[PDB]
Amino acid sequence: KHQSTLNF
Amino acid sequence: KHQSTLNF
Amino acid sequence: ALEARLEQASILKKVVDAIKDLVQDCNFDCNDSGIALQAMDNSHVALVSMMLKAEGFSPYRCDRNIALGVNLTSLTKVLRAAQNEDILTLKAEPDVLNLVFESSETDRISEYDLKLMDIDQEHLGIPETEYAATITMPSNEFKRITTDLMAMSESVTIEANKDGVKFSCQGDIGNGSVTLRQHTNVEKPNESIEIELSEPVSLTFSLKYLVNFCKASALSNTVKICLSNEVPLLVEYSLGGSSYLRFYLAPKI
Amino acid sequence: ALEARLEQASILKKVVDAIKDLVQDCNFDCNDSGIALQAMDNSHVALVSMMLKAEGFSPYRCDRNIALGVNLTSLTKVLRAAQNEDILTLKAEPDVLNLVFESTDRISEYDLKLMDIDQELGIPETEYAATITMPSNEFKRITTDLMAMSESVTIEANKDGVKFSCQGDIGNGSVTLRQHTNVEKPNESIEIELSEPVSLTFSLKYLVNFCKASALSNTVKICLSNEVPLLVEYSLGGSSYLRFYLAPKI
Amino acid sequence: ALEARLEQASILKKVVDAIKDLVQDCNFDCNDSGIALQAMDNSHVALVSMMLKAEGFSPYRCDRNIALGVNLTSLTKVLRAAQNEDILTLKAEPDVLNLVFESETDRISEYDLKLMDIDQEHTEYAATITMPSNEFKRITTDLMAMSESVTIEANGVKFSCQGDIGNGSVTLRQHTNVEKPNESIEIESLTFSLKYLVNFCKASALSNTVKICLSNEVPLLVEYSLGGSSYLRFYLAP
Ligand code: NA
Ligand code: NA
Ligand code: NA
Ligand code: NA
Ligand code: NA
Ligand code: NA
Ligand code: NA
Ligand code: NA
């Protein structure tokens, strides 16, 4: 539904 | 010379 | 209602590419004879008449007469996702046209459900017409001539007699003409210029429309241009069997 | 500090061409292992991770660890002046990156002004739920085609195959690829390693951008996990690579 | 006055395509030696000098010296309607230039181009470099990405520039290619606009080699030599 940010 | 419309 | 398999998607991609700049919305009419399209441009100057006969599919199944109301930009966006050599299946019950594209190479399957629209058919019946002149010529020759003359004029006059056909124009920069003599090419029959004429005939047409019709050049190696003082110009791209793509164009007067 | 010779400029031209629309400014990190790049796009949605290993050069000499802070538009303008089959030498002491392009006896020499760029990141070694190996051009065709009709693609993997699907104003689209081994043309294979079925959604704008790397590698590895970002890997000769990481839509 | 037949339209299409971005209006000068063009760009920085010698036609007939005042955009629109391998005939009495294009087939294209009245405004170099046309195109196009100006140094030859992103040079050593003579660099310091040089390089398709002639006293000559003693020449102020 919506754009997550980068999460390592 | 003006553009006529289709006539069948 | 409809289950129609083409051995190659190519045909449907070229037809839509050839038609989509003349006509935005239109109905594909499906019956036991196959799939027809009859659509006028917004100006009522040009009429597109297509028939893909049932024989051209493998197989063709129509259980019920249906219209598929399609936006040709939407349909183009879907047909772009088909390779020329993909096996294409059309299926409908309809709110949606189901398209399946199967690779000729891998086991890859593309599946599209295209939202259809209600579109009121503007169909008019075209009489069987005895034209004054018909010119058969290579499609690419007709594309070359219309594109070239459009650089220097909005209009082309088409003159036919026993000897040949002349396309001529005039513009701000001066005059242009292209003359083709009747000739039979024995080795390359599609390169022939064949002229059947009951009487000499001359009419004037918009090059913008003719150039548009020439986007169908890849469908057929030859094109039939049919002329009469009484009736609109027929530009016909004849296909395998009795299938065809036909463009009718009102003349300038 | 640096003296690095590539037998063919081609590789460096393709890498920069593949990355320059995602990332404007970035550091090339030079050490004894070779040349690395790790840069996020402005949105922090996408991460580019490149390594040209020392083995890929002939020779590679690093006397001192250095960062080359480069504008990729500037670098592109310079790399355009290299023929694919030119011998490319990188040299640096640095305020300037020296590039030499050798044909004939023709020599091109560029001194590119560098900028100070503050380096950002550790990526964990990840056991993905599914990996799909497929031809690069197949992935380019699919992402480009679906982008015509949608901003988003769902990637579904199982033992049998992988499905890319989308929905938009005009309707629904999907492309399904079955696991298959091509004996004659191995790059045309669809190989699926999966510990469990997995489905995630991504921006097609980003995926299409990653597909500008299609000319670097005949195959592309797409790696999926509910826990971690998408890995799109273009494996190169030896253990060199171009990798794109993409945060999913949730 | 004029009846000039070229075996192939190609040559006239390439010449106009090569010239039309430098020069809009200009005169084709027809005499018994053949067809000449001498036109400055609007800035009077660059001069185009073309001669298609009579020998290049089959046949060439001039009965009266004439100027054909032509807009090159108009002429381009007409020449696009000629296939490379068409037989091209130019005919004039003149208010009009008659062009006939003959096919393979029996097809005949005929154009009458409206002419305009255009007032005609009618060196031992220090260095000449002969090099492949495409090499000169590659160098000028590449350096133009990063600079408005190129310095040309000769003794081999070095093209160098500097700009916002840094410095660039290309060095060519004198070398004879025995198998592929057009690939040779034959040699027997000034600064120029790359915008103009790149424009001249639109003539690359006319000739496999280009002659660059340099002198402290006189403008740069960039010459695309053609069959026999016909030529396309560009002159550029430094
Ligand atoms: Na209709
Ligand atoms: Na036909
Ligand atoms: Na037929
Ligand atoms: Na070292
Ligand atoms: Na590898
Ligand atoms: Na004479
Ligand atoms: Na020559
Ligand atoms: Na010569």
Residue numbers in the entry:
A (entry chain K), B (entry chain J): 500 to 507
C (entry chain A): 1 to 93, 96 to 255
D (entry chain B): 1 to 93, 96 to 105, 108 to 124, 126 to 255
E (entry chain C): 1 to 93, 96 to 105, 107 to 125, 131 to 163, 166 to 198, 204 to 253
From the paper:
DNA polymerase δ (Pol δ) is a key enzyme for the maintenance of genome integrity in eukaryotic cells, acting in concert with the sliding clamp processivity factor PCNA (proliferating cell nuclear antigen). Three of the four subunits of human Pol δ interact directly with the PCNA homotrimer via a short, conserved protein sequence known as a PCNA interacting protein (PIP) motif.
Here, we describe the identification of a PIP motif located towards the N terminus of the PolD4 subunit of Pol δ (equivalent to human p12) from the thermophilic filamentous fungus Chaetomium thermophilum and present the X‐ray crystal structure of the corresponding peptide bound to PCNA at 2.45 Å. Like human p12, the fungal PolD4 PIP motif displays non‐canonical binding to PCNA. However, the structures of the human p12 and fungal PolD4 PIP motif peptides are quite distinct, with the fungal PolD4 PIP motif lacking the 310 helical segment that characterises most previously identified PIP motifs. Instead, the fungal PolD4 PIP motif binds PCNA via conserved glutamine that inserts into the Q‐pocket on the surface of PCNA and with conserved leucine and phenylalanine sidechains forming a compact 2‐fork plug that inserts into the hydrophobic pocket on PCNA. Despite the unusual binding mode of the fungal PolD4, isothermal calorimetry (ITC) measurements show that its affinity for PCNA is similar to that of its human orthologue. These observations add to a growing body of information on how diverse proteins interact with PCNA and highlight how binding modes can vary significantly between orthologous PCNA partner proteins.
